[PDB]
Ligand SMILES: Nc1ncnc2c1ncn2[C@@H]1O[C@H](COP(=O)(O)O)[C@@H](O)[C@H]1O
């Protein structure tokens with residue numbers, strides 16, 4: 185293979201360059217399962233492979249890093265993905281997580297409610313989303329770009345992602361948004377990453393690597409999602425848990441990436457080059473303050 | 486005067502044959518770590534499993550106040566190493582056992598401080 189010993193498979197660049205039409209996703213291995221190590225949950229394995237892949241990219245890793253994780257609750261009432269992120273991230277990293285339903289978490293702070301109720305004063309160095317509604321898996325209806333939490337995520341990135349920061353946002357055949365693909369062109373690099381443990385699913389993480397705050401490439405998101413599905417439809421990925429057994433190089437290196445505050449007028453080509461290489465983060469370095477909007481109602485008489 | 490005693494309730498439920506709390510979050514790790522009980526990153530040795538701390542805390546999992554005037558949690562935001570022989574019930578293990586304040590090992594499951 186070669187591929188079976190990786191944490192997963194990233195969309196090859198040539199598939200990004202196509203102009204495919206959207207088809208139904210029909211995966212050959214749809215129903216295969218990886219053999220997980222004894223007692224290990226799918227969500228731990230999936231997040232572990234995501235982080236192993238992110239270790240291969242040029243993520244900025246400043247002191248006093250700030251990471252926010254949407255869709256972090258499980259139907260079990262715990263947060264396995266958050267637990268993996270906290271293991272991966274340098275000790276001391278500020279980690280906030282959130283979900284619609286109540287759950288217990290290892291994050292530094294947790295907000296319960298619809299993601300649209302979440303507000304933050306500060307900018308973030310990394311945004312992870314596992315948000316998903318399994319109702320979208322209806323093959324009897326047309327597969328159009330979805331709004332909902334994707335509309336929130338797009339605005340949140342444009343308003344609250346530090347220049348230089350990165351994102352990993354979970355999509356599927358039916359859970360996707362064209363504007364989010366378009367926003368991938370505002371990063372120095374991007375891909376769609378499929379974990380080897382969950383390769384039987386049309387799930388992927390759309391990863392934007394080093395945010396530039398402006399279009400570097402113009403992407404048509406309807407077309408790009410068709411390109412992604414074409415890739416999946418024609419490239420069966422062998423289910424594999426092999427990478428889970430080598431955790432010796434798992435921790436994210438604390439690079440001490442520089443953080444500066446800068447005004448739009450100061451973002452020259454040399455700055456943009458440092459951003460693009462994972463060598464600079466642009467944001468305020470103030471205290472991290474978050475909140476959840478609460479709707480108040482009195483239902484008496 | 487009245488306070489719910491969740492610890493005693495779980496101990497008695499277990500002695501009566503109740504199934505231990507499940508879905509504690511087990512971490513992947515090298516299993517070449519220090520073996521200390523509660524750490525900022527997984528530190529299981531060959532004879533332990535590492536778990537996300539909040540998922541192994543009776544008070545976190547039951548949604549009840551922590552028995553501590555400040556309500557602080559020893560486990561949330563950390564990782565807990567559980568002997569593999571006791572990993573079927575991490576919440577029971579952390580409830581019933583104590584960490585040596587000197588070496589950070591579990592009393593009776595790694596602490597050698599009382600040796601000659
Ligand atoms: N609009 C939303 N705001 C916040 N969390 C959401 C939203 N939609 C879905 N989620 C969460 O996303 C998670 C998806 O995980 P799963 O359903 O296990 O793939 C669930 O815990 C949901 O509660």
Ligand SMILES: [Cl-]
Pocket residue numbers: 506546547
């Ligand atoms: Cl419970």
Ligand SMILES: [Zn+2]
Pocket residue numbers: 539542543544545546551558559560561
């Ligand atoms: Zn607790």
Ligand SMILES: [Zn+2]
Pocket residue numbers: 585586587588589590596597598599
């Ligand atoms: Zn000791």
